[PDB]
Design a protein around this ligand. Structure first.
Ligand SMILES: C[C@H]1[C@H](OC(=O)CCC(=O)O)O[C@@H]2O[C@@]3(C)CC[C@H]4[C@H](C)CC[C@@H]1[C@@]24OO3
Ligand SMILES: C[C@H]1[C@H](OC(=O)CCC(=O)O)O[C@@H]2O[C@@]3(C)CC[C@H]4[C@H](C)CC[C@@H]1[C@@]24OO3
Ligand SMILES: Nc1ncnc2c1ncn2[C@@H]1O[C@H](COP(=O)(O)OP(=O)(O)O)[C@@H](O)[C@H]1O
Ligand SMILES: Nc1ncnc2c1ncn2[C@@H]1O[C@H](COP(=O)(O)OP(=O)(O)O)[C@@H](O)[C@H]1O
Ligand SMILES: [Ca+2]
Ligand SMILES: [Ca+2]
Ligand SMILES: [Cl-]
Ligand SMILES: [Cl-]
Lengths: 412, 412
């Protein structure tokens, strides 16, 4: 089988439709970066749990109005006050300290003048309140920010630092989340040497394994290095079986064209009994990209057999593998972010949709970024993939300045 | 000292000007994600190191033209050929295999017809070449992609997956890079409990430590958890001394206003003998944000004393701390990426420049993203910080749809 040419849209949709969502596990909240909640999270306490001052100043009775007041004590952060403010009295407060019984407003220190103090100046005795406070001013009532019983995070939330801080706030230190996929990577070819090797006749160094592993690691997922596998079916089958045992996802590169020494598709079908959903994609680069699933004991393994050309391998990894991994780790909409950018140079269109790494840059006050195709600008890694449309009889070329879609693949 | 109000621009520039660049170390290339090269990197081999076929097909003499040819053997990937192609002969080749002596072009299999084979069909014997090849066609000459002696990566390059793959390609498996900063984080306040604690009267859980540690970890830097420190100068000094010993950067939160129990600025100046460069910033939120340096034995430590309010702490961490850490790890221009976005709702301007977390979203074919201020949209973490200008007599409010600056703080 020279597999049918699959459209890019059909290939991508097929990857997402066929990729499973992984099961769940309980983690410590500090380990939650990039995880997706598999439970709703509720507050068991009010925040604040006591009425809390917003200001350094004095807790007062608003009904007393402005005037001169006896200071009966201080409320400091972390201590519950024991005294009750009666008419004509106030209590000093600091930001975050509890409001004492009998007070209903806070007056910030700037709206006061101190009018009696102890001889040694350490104890405030009488203060002039210069304003009419409104009841409740500069107080966070109990539960103002979070109420006991409130759902503070919904299942499906993809967590970042602020969500971790919210779990800390509410004391929910263990949470149910989707698992991350474990991703195994192998390279294929009799010509490949390890990066650590000196060259030998007829040989080159394996770069795809490093590039692909780094790409997956950049997204936070655990990886397994399956090494270099020669161009023979027995070795390929054994390496695939090891990947299936050790990982949720297997990525290979090389050996997927129709060459005399290309065995991977035959091994996947006849030996592994995997279901190849597509074996060619009408895209540039990436024609021989292959995607398969394997259902064993009610678990679905997914296999990407990427082209061997290094540029093709990293482009197809970003287009197909990353969205699948995002679905596996529970992200509800796992699709890439697409930004509109201006082409930095003219480009010829191909009958196939074309993809190329680029750098996105925003310029002073200009609203749209520019996309500069790769290959001081060299100090930056690629953070985008230009997505060029197929040529038509009408449109054969795009011009500098014209707006194109760019897929985000790195931090901007 | 109620410290002077420092403009945002002066505060930010001061942080970057006063922050050092860390020294260098040698790392394994697989550990290079996010590192900055401190050396130029050179290729010691050509790529390809032999003339390499781009195609499955036949190595031919272009001068023979089209016609029927004897196939004298095969060149397979990873094997140096030993035979010389003479007039009237060709050799089978596969993609990435070396071109044999005597051949000067490759004809892809699609431009041929097989016209003699062995009885068992395993050996090709004669092929009809249907095209006139151009000399050099479908061959990558030695060094076409990389030449021995070529600088392939310059010092100052901020590495991603493709740079790691390039180090693998050229066999440079150990590289000199800038160190990453080690960042210590402490929280302050007598009211704070650990996230793991049940509440006690007058107390709340410490969230800032978790949020700040997660923010720093998201950027890839090692962290040290200095815990909760009470509101007293001895304990604050001891915790700062531990941070200085263990880390390059110390982040505190809380205790930086003028309150009765706020000691940190006094401790930094009088006890630690640090140089406080600013102690207030004209910004909303973040008024009491403080930045200090401490020079010990020719090493500069940097200290950020952030406000205690949780929103203020995470906003000021993203504005001031992250750019400093990027400078420390060697990034040449460590400043944030600013994108233009449309406001999703009307906003009132303040005399101070105002900052608020938001979510940036790109809509179908609309060129500019929308910025939706925080507090299915809830499934996403904040990836931006709205940067609102100070009000003027002319401009008091911004309206839905108007374009504003947004600082990127998360993956888009
Ligand atoms: C065909 C459409 C797909 O559409 C679906 O996947 C529908 C089923 C589903 O949403 O699961 O989305 C994708 O992702 C973005 C956000 C950009 C990237 C594009 C992919 C690179 C190609 C498929 C295309 C693509 O366009 O839009
Ligand atoms: C005042 C200018 C500063 O300008 C310098 O830092 C000049 C000295 C130097 O470049 O080192 O850059 C910054 O970073 C961006 C990219 C956006 C973020 C802004 C900061 C939030 C505030 C400072 C401002 C800022 O605007 O531009
Ligand atoms: N891991 C790798 N690192 C670098 N180059 C590779 C790697 N794997 C394959 N290549 C190169 O990519 C090209 C395409 O290889 P491949 O996809 O295996 O084609 P075929 O299936 O026809 O052998 C060849 O030049 C090959 O040497
Ligand atoms: N680590 C923290 N976690 C959550 N809230 C905090 C933290 N530190 C301080 N806060 C709260 O932030 C607010 C401001 O505190 P802070 O900056 O210490 O003010 P002051 O210096 O006046 O005591 C208070 O409500 C305080 O309880
Ligand atoms: Ca191969
Ligand atoms: Ca405090
Ligand atoms: Cl390809
Ligand atoms: Cl603040």
């Amino acid at each position: 089988s020279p597999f049918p040419l699959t459209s890019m849209d059909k290939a991508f949709i097929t990857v997402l439709e066929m990729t499973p969502v992984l099961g769940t596990e309980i983690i410590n909240y500090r380990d939650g970066m990039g995880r997706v909640l598999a439970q709703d999270v509720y507050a068991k306490d009010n925040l604040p749990p006591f009425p809390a001052s917003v200001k350094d100043g004095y807790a007062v009775r608003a009904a007393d109005g402005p005037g001169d007041r006896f200071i009966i004590g201080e409320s400091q952060a972390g201590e519950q006050p024991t005294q009750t403010v009666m008419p004509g009295q106030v209590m000093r407060v600091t930001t975050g300290a509890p409001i004492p019984c009998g007070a209903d407003a806070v007056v910030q220190v700037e709206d006061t003048e101190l009018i009696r103090e102890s001889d040694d100046g350490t104890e405030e005795l009488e203060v002039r309140i210069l304003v009419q406070a409104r009841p409740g001013q500069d107080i966070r009532p109990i539960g103002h920010d979070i109420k006991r019983g409130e759902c503070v995070l919904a299942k499906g939330t993809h967590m970042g630092p602020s969500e971790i801080g919210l779990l800390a706030t509410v004391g929910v230190t263990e949470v149910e989340v989707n698992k991350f996929p474990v991703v195994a990577v192998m390279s294929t070819g009799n010509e490949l040497l390890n990066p650590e090797d000196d060259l030998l006749p007829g040989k080159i160094r394996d770069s795809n394994r490093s590039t692909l592993l780094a790409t997956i690691q950049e997204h936070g997922y655990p990886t397994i290095n399956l090494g270099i596998v020669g161009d023979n079916p027995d070795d390929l089958l054994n390496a695939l079986n090891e990947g299936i045992s050790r990982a949720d996802v297997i990525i290979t590169s090389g050996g997927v064209s129709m060459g005399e020494k290309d065995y991977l598709k035959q091994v996947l079908d006849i030996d592994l009994h995997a279901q190849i959903h597509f074996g060619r994609v009408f895209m540039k680069p990436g024609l021989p990209t292959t995607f398969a699933t394997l259902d064993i004991d009610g678990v679905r393994k997914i296999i990407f057999a990427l082209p061997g050309n290094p540029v093709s391998a990293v482009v197809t990894c970003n287009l197909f593998v990353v969205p699948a991994l995002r679905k596996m780790q529970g992200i509800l909409d796992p699709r890439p972010t697409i930004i509109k950018a201006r082409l930095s140079c003219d480009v010829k269109l191909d009958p196939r949709p074309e993809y190329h790494r680029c750098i996105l840059t925003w310029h002073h006050q200009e609203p749209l970024p520019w996309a500069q195709s790769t290959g001081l600008m060299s100090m930056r890694s690629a953070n985008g993939l230009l997505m060029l449309p197929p040529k038509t009889e009408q449109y054969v070329e795009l011009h500098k300045g014209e707006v194109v879609d760019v897929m985000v693949i790195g931090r901007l």
